[PDB]
From a paper:
Kinetoplastids (such as Trypanosoma brucei), a group of evolutionarily divergent eukaryotes, have a unique set of kinetochore proteins that lack any significant homology to canonical kinetochore components. We previously identified KKT4 as a microtubule-binding kinetochore protein in T. brucei (throughout this manuscript we refer to KKT4 from Trypanosoma brucei unless stated otherwise) (Llauro et al., 2018). KKT4 directly binds to microtubules and maintains load-bearing attachments to both growing and shortening microtubule tips in vitro. KKT4 has the following predicted regions conserved among kinetoplastid species: an N-terminal α helix, a coiled-coil region and a block of basic residues in the microtubule-binding domain, and a BRCT domain at the C terminus.
To understand the function of the KKT4 BRCT domain, we solved its structure using X-ray crystallography. KKT4463–645 yielded crystals that diffracted to a resolution of 1.6 Å. The structure of KKT4463–645 revealed tandem BRCT domains. The N-terminal full domain (BRCT1) consists of a central four-stranded β sheet flanked by two α helices on one side of the sheet and one α helix on the opposite side. The smaller domain (BRCT2) consists of two α helices and three β strands, missing a β strand and an α helix in the C terminus. No electron density was observed for residues 463–473, 519–523, and 617–625, suggesting that these regions are flexible. Superposition of KKT4 BRCT1 with the N-terminal BRCT domain of H. sapiens BRCA1 showed a good structural match with an RMSD of 1.11 Å (for 65 Cα), suggesting that the KKT4 BRCT domain may bind phosphopeptides. In fact, we observed additional electron density in our structure, likely arising from a sulfate ion that may mimic a bound phosphate group. The sulfate ion is coordinated by three residues in the pocket, T494, S495, and K543, which correspond to the key residues known to interact with phosphopeptides in other BRCT domains (e.g., S1655, G1656, and K1702 in human BRCA1) (Williams et al., 2004). Furthermore, replacement of K543, located in the putative phosphopeptide-binding site in KKT4BRCT with alanine, decreased the binding affinity by roughly an order of magnitude.
Residue numbers in the entry: 474 to 518, 524 to 616, 626 to 645
The structure:
C-alpha cells in the first residue's frame, strides 16, 4: 500500500468483476455500496462466479474462495482497495495498493501428495488443487500436510 499522495497511480480502465469472501455483513454491504458508488466499469457479481476478476477479503487468504482466487490468478484485495479508490475518484492500481495476484496459475499441471488424513480439510484442498489445474496423487510431486503449505507453495512460484 504505497500510492503517491500526489498523482496516485491509476488502475487500468476496464471491467472489474468483484466478489467478497469471509467479510462481516456490515463490511460486505459497505464494500458493495462503494463499488456501486464509484462505478467506472466495476460490478459486484461454482466456487467462484465464472466472471470473477477481483476478490475482496480482509486479511490473508484463508477461505476456499480466497484460495481458489490465489490459484486462478484473480486479484485478492483488501476492503481498503475499494474505499481508497472511492476516495481517489478512480480505481487505483491494484499492485500499488498491495493487492495480490499470482500469474501464471501456480498449481497448473503439477501433482500434489496430501499427507493428511481424510476429512473436510483434505477435501477442500483437493478442490483447490483441481481448481488451479493441478492433480491430487491418489517422483515429481509436491508434498502438502496443511493448507498453509499449499498456500505458501502457491504464492512462491515463478
Amino acid at each position: 500500500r504505497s500510492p503517491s499522495p500526489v498523482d496516485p497511480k491509476r488502475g487500468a480502465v476496464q471491467p472489474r468483476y468483484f466478489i467478497t469472501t469471509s467479510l462481516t455483513e456490515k463490511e460486505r454491504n459497505s464494500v458493495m455500496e462503494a463499488i456501486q458508488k464509484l462505478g467506472q466499469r466495476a460490478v459486484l457479481v461454482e466456487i467462484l462466479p465464472l466472471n470473477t476478476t477481483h476478490i475482496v477479503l480482509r486479511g490473508p487468504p484463508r477461505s476456499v474462495k480466497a484460495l481458489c482466487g490465489v490459484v486462478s490468478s484473480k486479484w485478492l484485495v483488501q476492503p481498503s482497495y475499494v474505499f481508497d479508490s472511492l476516495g481517489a475518484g478512480f480505481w487505483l492500481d491494484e499492485e500499488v495498493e498491495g493487492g495480490l495476484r499470482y500469474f501464471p496459475p501456480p498449481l497448473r499441471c503439477q501433482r500434489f501428495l496430501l499427507t493428511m488424513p481424510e476429512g473436510v480439510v483434505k477435501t477442500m484442498l483437493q478442490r483447490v488443487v483441481e481448481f488451479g489445474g493441478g492433480e491430487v496423487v491418489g517422483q515429481d510431486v509436491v508434498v502438502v500436510s496443511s493448507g498453509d503449505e499449499l498456500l505458501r507453495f502457491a504464492i512462491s512460484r515463478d
